[PDB]
């Protein structure tokens, strides 16, 4: 007669894309639409019990989250879990919910190992996955003749969820799975100046197609040093793995988009450096349902959550929680519609998997593995104005690169530089 | 009026040094000795509640173990936890028990990160630690002039607890913490023949002081290939990181000790190869209390556990569970003796820490960090007979290398070869 949804997310800390101050109202929106739909669970009153994934210091915890999962499981016996979004929170909760035979839904947890559904059974990911970033990088190399060597530099803050590590792991494993080219990798520490001579040396010794997962300022400083050392777009290309567009403003206003602009008198130098730089991000959803969702999300979060949802790519995480929830409610109704129950975890999950769906994020496809296909944009600068704009788009379901607004990929030599230099790297 | 001890160990699988078929009777011995002592918890009837750390397949689990921990915690509210011994079981349970403010005791969990007691608070390790292996390797290098470079090769079986990884991690981090020499490392897969050309090439390119953590047969095959390729004790030394002496028989009988012997017609070749090879193991306890303990352990396990405890270094793990338990019971009795309670986790733990104790394993010292100092033996072959015997012993508390039975370390050149070759590695 009613459905119990257990939530394990950051209830107090509002810094995460999957924080409750932002996912909560998007879930409220999805529940309110379930009510207004007589074709989605008619009569059931879907209730929600919350559990915080964060520890005493307020960051997402490999301990608070699985404890919260056990506490909600015995106190309310839910039929589905929502979250966590942090990798180290989601991995133990995922293994618990797999053992409990309870489906798990999250728009976070993008790490490679969550993809092993043999272990994380009944885990359905409706947000991005880092293997999908490897799909995009694969298609990018195939469409640009780079079939030999790439270099990946990544850095994390000690004690975080290691987002750049997992980003690089997904890219690394999938790209070598599909292309079998040599992917060199090097970890650094952003605040440690000793690493920058080492990085610049490895940049000019280990690759010419160079991916960097770092903060905007680290990526900027690395570019400044690369120009100062004579590394230009004729030989090198530096992709910034900035999936949430942290180095960019929102796609709503703030025209134009300048990541090299900082106001430290280095901006003129940074722009010439950034001529060799391109930014890989998630794709902003186009459909008008998304913009209307943003308006209602902003209203409802400022209302019943005392939080101000600003514009940006991070809002695709609450939008995907929303969409995943509706995708789940429909699957339950279909299972009920054939004699099943709300606890038929495997039946419900398989109705969700290998399935296309229409939600506020537009067309979203769950693959055979239970993971949402992820679309990516490629940003490039206009050599006239210097501002960055989308020039390439990747459809994760079809794995096709489509040019955007008749733009071209800027190259100082007229075509992309080779992934291997003239007479070897020496 | 009674003490509740929660146990999370392998209750059914009897393959682990910390399996219950082996730890259970050692703990029953320790409890029966608490009864017979009027100075240890007089009147308290110490009860035990068990929980299996193993999953459905019967191997120790990062999921079954923390679930078992939560289940014993709410069902019995114990005052102390015993186990797990596996790293991936012990890390989540450790974080739970730290959060619950309940002391944790184990002779397993030797990984580097368990030593961060800031996180794994009130975790006391009474068995070996892999950082202690690094102390031994440090002392070995200081006493032999190797102060430049070493190479570490290690391999694991996919899906195990990664024992060789954690062994190498402890050796690597502690040794570079104290010597700051270049420690090269390489992982391989024992069953994959592709790696053996790669290893042999790295052996003669990355080091001459070479530590290998692998199975006996892999270490043996690696030695045979090193002789076949002309790598002898005049230039190279190969340490086998075989801490449980899997490549050797027990110290009780089976005279003499021949790890190169296999019965495949390669034994004559293997002996010449093994002239360059020395084996690092835990030290067999000497004291006669240990031998009497072994007799009572064998009797009690064959009695109330239907298990046959054979001789070997692995028995120091149940012996240390036994000793740690008594060390804990005394600490509780001391806490009770000053008005404390059995739940003063911090008070009890600090009485146990930075403290020497006399147990069936003889003299055992808990360091300031809560970890038992670990003694190591170094096995070498007699060039006359070819059999291996202890020639060096490392006291972990005093960090001293003492020669054993007036033996000398065998060197084909009369002294150890340099950790760096003649005119560089080229």
């Amino acid at each position: 007669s009613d459905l119990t949804v257990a939530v394990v997310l950051p209830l107090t800390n509002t810094s995460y894309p999957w924080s409750w101050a932002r996912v909560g109202p998007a879930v409220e929106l999805a529940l309110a639409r379930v009510k207004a739909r007589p074709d989605l669970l008619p009569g059931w009153t879907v209730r929600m019990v919350l559990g915080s994934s964060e520890n005493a210091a307020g960051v997402c915890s490999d301990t608070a989250a699985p404890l919260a999962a056990v506490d909600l499981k015995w106190e309310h016996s839910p039929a589905v879990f929502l979250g966590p979004g942090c990798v180290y929170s989601a991995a133990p909760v995922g293994r618990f919910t797999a053992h409990w035979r309870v489906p798990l839904l999250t728009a976070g947890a993008p790490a490679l190992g969550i993809g092993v559904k043999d272990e994380y059974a009944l885990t359905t990911r409706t947000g991005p996955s880092h293997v999908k970033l490897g799909d995009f990088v694969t298609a990018l190399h195939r469409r640009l003749g780079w079939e030999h060597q790439a270099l990946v530099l990544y850095a994390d803050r000690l004690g975080d969820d290691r987002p750049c590590f997992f980003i690089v792991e997904g890219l690394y494993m999938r790209v070598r799975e599909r292309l079998n080219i040599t992917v060199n990798h090097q970890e650094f520490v952003e605040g440690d100046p000793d690493h920058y001579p080492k990085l610049l040396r490895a940049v000019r010794r280990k690759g010419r197609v160079i991916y960097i997962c770092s903060s905007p300022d680290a990526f900027r400083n690395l570019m400044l040093l690369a120009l100062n050392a004579g590394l230009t777009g004729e030989d090198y290309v530096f992709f910034h793995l900035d999936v949430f567009g942290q180095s960019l403003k929102s796609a709503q206003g703030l025209v134009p988009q300048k990541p090299w602009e900082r106001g430290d008198g280095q901006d003129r130098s940074a722009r010439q450096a950034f001529q060799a730089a391109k930014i890989i991000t998630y794709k902003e959803p186009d459909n008008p349902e998304y913009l209307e969702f943003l308006k209602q999300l902003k209203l409802l979060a400022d209302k019943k959550f005392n939080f101000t949802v600003e514009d940006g790519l991070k809002n695709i995480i609450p939008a995907s929680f929303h969409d995943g929830l509706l995708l789940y409610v429909q699957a339950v109704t279909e299972t009920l519609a054939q004699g099943g129950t709300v606890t038929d975890g495997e039946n419900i999950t398989q109705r969700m998997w290998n399935r296309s769906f229409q939600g506020v994020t537009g067309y979203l496809k769950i693959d055979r593995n239970g993971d949402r296909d992820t679309d990516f944009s490629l940003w490039d600068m206009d050599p006239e104005t210097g501002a960055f704009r989308v020039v390439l788009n990747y459809n994760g379901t079809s794995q096709e690169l489509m040019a955007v607004s008749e733009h071209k990929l800027y190259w100082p030599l007229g075509y992309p530089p080779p992934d291997v230099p003239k007479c070897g790297f020496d | 009026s009674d003490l509740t001890v929660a146990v999370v160990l392998p209750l059914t699988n009897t393959s682990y040094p910390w399996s219950w078929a082996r730890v259970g009777p050692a703990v029953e011995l320790a409890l029966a000795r608490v009864k017979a002592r009027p100075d240890l918890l007089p009147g308290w009837t110490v009860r035990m509640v068990l929980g299996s750390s193993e999953n459905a397949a019967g191997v120790c689990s990062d999921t079954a173990a923390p679930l078992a921990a939560v289940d014993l915690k709410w069902e019995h509210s114990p005052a102390v936890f015993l186990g797990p011994g596996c790293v991936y079981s012990a890390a989540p349970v450790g974080r739970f028990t730290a959060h619950w403010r309940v002391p944790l005791l184990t002779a397993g969990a030797p990984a580097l990160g368990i030593g961060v007691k800031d996180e794994y608070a009130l975790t006391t390790r009474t068995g070996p630690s892999h950082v202690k292996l690094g102390d031994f390797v440090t002392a070995l290098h200081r006493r032999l002039g190797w102060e430049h470079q070493a190479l570490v090769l290690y391999a694991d079986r996919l899906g195990d607890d990664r024992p060789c990884f954690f062994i190498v991690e402890g050796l690597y981090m502690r040794v570079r913490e104290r010597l700051n020499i270049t420690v090269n490392h390489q992982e391989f897969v024992e069953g994959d023949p592709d790696h053996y050309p790669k290893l042999l090439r790295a052996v003669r390119r990355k080091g001459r002081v070479i530590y290998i953590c692998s199975s006996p047969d892999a270490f043996r095959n690696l030695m045979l290939l090193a002789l076949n390729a002309g790598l002898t004790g005049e230039d190279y030394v190969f340490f086998h990181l075989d801490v449980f002496g899997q490549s050797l028989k027990s110290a009780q009988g089976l005279v003499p000790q021949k790890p190169w012997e296999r019965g495949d017609g390669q034994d004559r070749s293997a002996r010449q190869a093994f002239q360059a090879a020395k084996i690092i193991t835990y030290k067999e306890p000497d004291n006669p209390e240990y031998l009497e303990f072994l007799k009572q352990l064998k009797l009690l396990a064959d009695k109330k556990f239907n298990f046959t405890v054979e001789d070997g270094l692995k028995n120091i793990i149940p012996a240390s569970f036994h000793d740690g338990l008594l060390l804990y019971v005394q600490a509780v009795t001391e806490t009770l003796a000053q008005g404390g309670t059995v739940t003063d986790g911090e008070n009890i733990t600090q009485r146990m820490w930075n403290r020497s104790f006399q147990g069936v394993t003889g003299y055992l010292k808990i360091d300031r960090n809560g970890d038992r100092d670990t003694d190591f033996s170094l096995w070498d072959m007699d060039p006359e007979t070819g059999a291996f015997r202890v020639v060096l012993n490392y006291n972990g508390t005093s960090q001293e290398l003492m020669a054993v039975s007036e033996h000398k370390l065998y060197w084909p050149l009369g002294y150890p070869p340099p950790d760096v070759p003649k005119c560089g590695f080229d």
Binding site: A91, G113, H185, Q186 | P92, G113
Partner: peptide, 25 residues
């Protein structure tokens, strides 16, 4: 498989890298 990537998701396995190419640790 990989020497650096694919090895579980517990902070216990990220205390040194040791398979990885890192300047820290």
């Amino acid at each position: 498989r990989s020497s650096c990537f694919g090895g579980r998701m517990d902070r216990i396995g990220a205390q040194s890298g040791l398979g990885c190419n890192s300047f820290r640790y």
